[PDB]
RNA sequence: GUGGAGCCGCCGCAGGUGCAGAUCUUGGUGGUAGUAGCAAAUAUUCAAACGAGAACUUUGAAGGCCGAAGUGGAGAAGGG
RNA sequence: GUGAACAGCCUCUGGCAUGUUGGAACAAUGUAGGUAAGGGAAGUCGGCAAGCCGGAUCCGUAACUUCGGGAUAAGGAUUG
RNA sequence: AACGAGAUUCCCACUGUCCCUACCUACUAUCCAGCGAAACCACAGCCAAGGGAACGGGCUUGGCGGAAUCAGCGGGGAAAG
């Protein structure tokens, strides 16, 4: 399809997109603002240390009630968290971006992540059962995430 | 990359302390693992069935205070993990722990 | 490698409970092939499925 | 409105921000006044509290009902290895307060001082003062180094002394020196400053700073108890049993119209680990520890004039949670702020007192070195095995 | 700029004629909020197999509970 | 098996996986379960709540009464 | 008389009801991986005094006023239903 902000040079740029996939929106938004502008082999290595809880993800915007961890000092912040389901869905797609790069005849040793956005998908619902005969929803909030990779040279 | 084998004393009574009555034997095996990944230094730790029985021989809340183990660093095969070493932590029974120290065995 | 059916049919043909069945867990893919009772009585005779005898409750004391 | 029954305040508002203090080593907030006529001397000293015992002393207080009898007193003992003077700081006064003029450090500084200047000594290249030592020996850096003592002597009016502790002499696992900065309150500033250039990188013992029955002050950080509730942080009265939502809480935390929770009300937060200064702690004994190997080191602490034994003040089994004392020590009457193994700065008193309870002499008659790790009932191991006899300990010889 | 098949001015005529509110109706979405919470009835652990993938599946061993007015074995009503 | 007992507690036959999740930590406040020196209702609207007493054997049992009761009154001793 | 999960006063024994609180345990709360609501919501949120629909978050005159937040808390929001 058509993305947000077509890159300045499409010959030496690669891209991926993942639609309608079930993560939390808010935690995936903030593991993507950690790796924006980051090189792919650093981003692939940083995302492993989130799932192994050796290096965290600072929660900068959607941070209501998010507790504090010492690994958030590298980011200049206080609050941080380690979303492992979110760090696998945009690591399984970061492989897809370097799977598309070698089909486009591009070098992966200089690919950086220029553009990455997460925005919301339609919420799919199920319902819970509260006091006094009441129903209230467990609405799930999945997301469309979307990324551009560019060689620097 | 060694294939060596050593045998140790573990006092479990020191390493679990102030642990609850229903978590007292289940911790006692995730303190044997944290020993063997500290000592043999590998994340892959296998223990066998005859050592599970020796810790659980007295229920959960009554752990035997001290056990005599042997640790075998070995290697793996058939599309293994990117770590190729693992430890088989197995059990040698003893009757008396006094004057027992960690010897290197052949 | 679900062995729920072979667990169920054995306790019906051994006339025992589901609890008292089958030491020797090595032949899994052999006894997972048996999906009949006529097949399961062969595995008894070839010794891959045993009765696992009754727990002691001595009235000695 | 008019409570019907008057009670006083729970807690003191003088210590109000019940905060984790920003220091582990106690800061001297105000040093004792210094006069030129009086001899030249230091004023504070660092020590590490080891534990408590008690004592038996012959009281001498005419008029009381205790006079000329034996009294037990609970004493704490504080192991103080001799300090090493490292640097000299001058302070010139402004109409905005005191201001640091400049500092001169010793020629070659110790290795455990340098460990204080790093949060990671292992990942370091230990490069501190490598370029500052070279100016004591390069002569261009040296004839201006003597210039900074003459401008020190001319302008600044109060000078202090940077010293540290010899953590090699203690059973702790710490090895970082505690670097203190203490004030010389002696004569005039030229004799006050030539008294410190003479003794850079040289040891200063404890008996040269303090004296026997010379009443001092203890400055420390309190026993940290954590995040504790209202009835333990402020000792507020518990509610009766029937109370819904909670027993151990303060009920009315204010009126309607002040419309804000006042500062003067009791509520939950961090209890302990606060900076406090005790006043008027009497010294009973300045002991010296574990001398020469020519004949014997000699343990010989806690052996008063009536005891006459080969005792030493470290109790039978070693101090609980501290270790085994090999150094010079100070013993102080009463409780003293801090856990064991905790730094606390001993300090001469600001105020003068005569008061006939200070300034009195004391003669100890007994120090029990019985085991504190339970109910000890023996004192020296020979006194135990003389009473106990032989056991199954040898069983071959 | 999108969009892809109809529409508008003037002279008269005719109304189901113009919204910010009605604890308005129907539909949609926020902040609260990745927060409250996923805490009644003691309890799990080791190896293995299948697998892209196992705290939860199956199996083997150990530890436990229901303890014959049962967490066992059969039915009526109801469910289909 | 214990016991007066289809009481409670512990196992066998036969079941089950701790009741819609796990991991680490052991602060406050709670909810549930306990102990407490000296005093013993001084607490409070009120002994609320909790605690004492408790099985059985041999003794011994008052006022009152519709002469049936009260009554395991009360108070005692013993138990492996 | 007997009998009351009935109302009441006193006495013996008993005791954390209290003097005066303390400590221990389990499940939480807390931190994390996964999953995730609702109430409520003009705009919003530091005070004092004044005037006012006579008791202000806003107005007037003063006091003053730094990002983002985490555990609690029950003064207020003349809090919500
Ligand atoms: Mg001061």
Swiss-Prot record, chain A:
It is found in: Cytoplasm. Its main location: cytoplasm. One of its GO terms (cellular component) is cytosolic large ribosomal subunit. Expressed in pancreas, lung, colon, cystic duct, gall bladder, kidney and liver. Expressed at high levels in the well differentiated pancreatic tumor cell lines HPAF, COLO 357 and Capan-1, the moderately differentiated pancreatic tumor cell lines T3M-4, AsPc-1 and BxPc-3, the poorly differentiated pancreatic tumor cell line MIA PaCa-2, and the pancreatic tumor cell lines of undefined differentiation status such as SW979. Expressed at lower levels in the poorly differentiated pancreatic tumor cell lines HCG-25 and PANC-1. Keywords: Cytoplasm, Ribonucleoprotein, Ribosomal protein. GO terms for biological process: cytoplasmic translation; translation. GO terms for molecular function: RNA binding; structural constituent of ribosome. Component of the large ribosomal subunit. Belongs to the universal ribosomal protein uL22 family. Component of the large ribosomal subunit. The ribosome is a large ribonucleoprotein complex responsible for the synthesis of proteins in the cell. This is Large ribosomal subunit protein uL22. It comes from Homo sapiens. The chain holds residues 2 to 154 of 184 of the full protein.
Swiss-Prot record, chain B:
The modification N6-acetyllysine is found at residue 58. Keywords: Acetylation, Cytoplasm, Phosphoprotein, Ribonucleoprotein, Ribosomal protein. Its main location: cytoplasm. The keyword NADP does not apply. The modification Phosphoserine is found at residue 81. The modification N6-succinyllysine is found at residues 38, 53, 58. It is found in: Cytoplasm. GO terms for cellular component: cytoplasm; cytosol; cytosolic large ribosomal subunit; cytosolic ribosome; extracellular exosome; focal adhesion; membrane; nucleoplasm. The keyword Ribonucleoprotein applies. Belongs to the eukaryotic ribosomal protein eL31 family. Component of the large ribosomal subunit. Component of the large ribosomal subunit. The ribosome is a large ribonucleoprotein complex responsible for the synthesis of proteins in the cell. This is Large ribosomal subunit protein eL31. The chain holds residues 18 to 123 of 125 of the full protein.
UniProtKB/Swiss-Prot annotation, chain C:
Keywords: Citrullination, Cytoplasm, Isopeptide bond, Phosphoprotein, Ribonucleoprotein, Ribosomal protein, Ubl conjugation. GO terms for molecular function: RNA binding; structural constituent of ribosome. One of its GO terms (biological process) is cytoplasmic translation. GO terms for cellular component: cytoplasm; cytosol; cytosolic large ribosomal subunit; cytosolic ribosome; focal adhesion; membrane; nucleolus; synapse. Transmembrane segments: none annotated. Citrullinated by PADI4. It comes from the Eukaryota. The modification Phosphoserine is found at residue 12. It is found in: Cytoplasm. The keyword Phosphoprotein applies. The modification Citrulline is found at residues 4, 15, 37. Component of the large ribosomal subunit. Belongs to the eukaryotic ribosomal protein eL19 family. Component of the large ribosomal subunit. The ribosome is a large ribonucleoprotein complex responsible for the synthesis of proteins in the cell. This is Large ribosomal subunit protein eL19. It comes from Homo sapiens (Human). The gene is RPL19. The chain holds residues 2 to 62 of 196 of the full protein.
From Swiss-Prot, chain D:
It comes from the Eukaryota. GO terms for cellular component: cytoplasm; cytosol; cytosolic large ribosomal subunit; cytosolic ribosome; extracellular exosome; focal adhesion; nucleolus; nucleus. Coiled coil: none annotated. It is found in: Nucleus, Nucleolus; Cytoplasm. GO terms for biological process: cellular response to interleukin-4; cytoplasmic translation; translation. The keyword Manganese does not apply. There is a cross-link at residues 38, 223, 225, 285, 365, 385, 392 (Glycyl lysine isopeptide (Lys-Gly) (interchain with G-Cter in SUMO2)). PROSITE patterns: RIBOSOMAL_L3 (PS00474). The modification Tele-methylhistidine is found at residue 244. Component of the large ribosomal subunit. The ribosome is a large ribonucleoprotein complex responsible for the synthesis of proteins in the cell. This is Large ribosomal subunit protein uL3. It comes from Homo sapiens. The lineage of its organism: Eukaryota, Metazoa, Chordata, Craniata, Vertebrata.
